[PDB]
From a paper:
In mouse CNPase, this is done by His230, Thr232, His309, and Thr311, in a manner, where a nucleophilic water molecule activated by His309 can attack the cyclic phosphate and a pentavalent transition state is formed. Mutation of active-site histidine residues (H230Q, H230S, H309Q, H309S, and H230Q/H309Q double mutant) abolishes CNPase activity. However, only H230S and H309S could be used to trap nucleotide ligands within the active site, whereas H309Q and the H230Q/H309Q double mutant could not. The results indicate that all the variants were correctly folded and heat-stable, with the largest destabilization, 8–9 °C, caused by the H230Q/H309Q double mutation.
2′,3′-cyclic nucleotide 3′-phosphodiesterase (CNPase) comprises 4% of total myelin protein in the central nervous system (CNS), being the most abundant CNS non-compact myelin protein4. CNPase consists of an N-terminal polynucleotide kinase-like domain10, a catalytic phosphodiesterase domain11, and a membrane-anchored C-terminal tail, which contains a cysteine residue that undergoes isoprenylation. The CNPase catalytic site, lying in a groove between two lobes, has pseudo two-fold symmetry and contains two apposing His-X-Thr-X (X denotes a hydrophobic residue) motifs, characteristic for 2H phosphoesterases 113537.
Residue numbers in the entry: 162 to 209, 212 to 292, 300 to 378
């Protein structure tokens, strides 16, 4: 038996990764500057030379190219890993190029990320291990706070998408070049892009 990757996912191309990463940074710089954000600072961090630099706050960022993870396998140790990797669709798609659609950027006290909206064919690659449809958790992580783990970004996203589903999104508290800014409370923020970003990526396995 040959062992599996650390994980499967869509790995963005150099160009797409650079584009998204840069858009992510601009958003953190813009957000940290926004009046509506500075007002809610107490809900973002507990601690207290007045401005918070969000780029600094999300002090852990992906070292290489950005990526959208499907199944964490831990070389076969993760539950369902073998079952996921044995699927025809996974084996067929391995090394194939895809286009991912980014619909929004979001920030919480724990993570910063980009929401990915998967096509139906891409959803075939989403593992099957709430009231939101499958694949809602899909995202690209842009940054995390010092003690936060990668799995958190997907959780943060779902929590945001639930707030939207319930109509607690609210009126846009601002307008950024790329879209409307929304305050969901508890340090949560979302930029709904006027125009969805398309990024190119390759579906494959990372071995560490």
């Amino acid at each position: 038996k040959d062992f599996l990757p650390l994980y499967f996912g869509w790995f963005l191309t150099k160009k797409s990764s650079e584009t998204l990463r840069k858009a992510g940074q601009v958003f953190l710089e813009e957000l940290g500057n926004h009046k509506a954000f500075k007002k809610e600072l107490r809900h973002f961090i507990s601690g207290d030379k007045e401005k918070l630099e969000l780029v600094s706050y999300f002090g852990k960022r992906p070292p290489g190219v950005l990526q959208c993870t499907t199944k964490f396998c831990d070389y076969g140790k993760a539950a369902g890993a073998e079952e996921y990797a044995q699927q025809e669709v996974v084996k067929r798609s391995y090394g194939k190029a895809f286009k991912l659609s980014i619909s929004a950027l979001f920030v919480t006290p724990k993570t910063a990320g980009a929401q990915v909206v998967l096509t139906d064919q891409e959803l075939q690659l989403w593992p099957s291990d709430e009231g939101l449809p499958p694949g809602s958790r899909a995202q690209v992580t842009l940054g995390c706070a010092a003690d936060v783990q990668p799995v958190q970004t997907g959780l943060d996203l779902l929590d945001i998408l639930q707030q939207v589903k319930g109509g607690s999104q609210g009126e846009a508290v601002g307008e950024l070049p790329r879209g409307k800014l929304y305050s969901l409370g508890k340090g949560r923020w979302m930029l709904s892009l006027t125009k969805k970003m398309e990024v190119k990526a390759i579906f494959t396995g990372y071995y560490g």
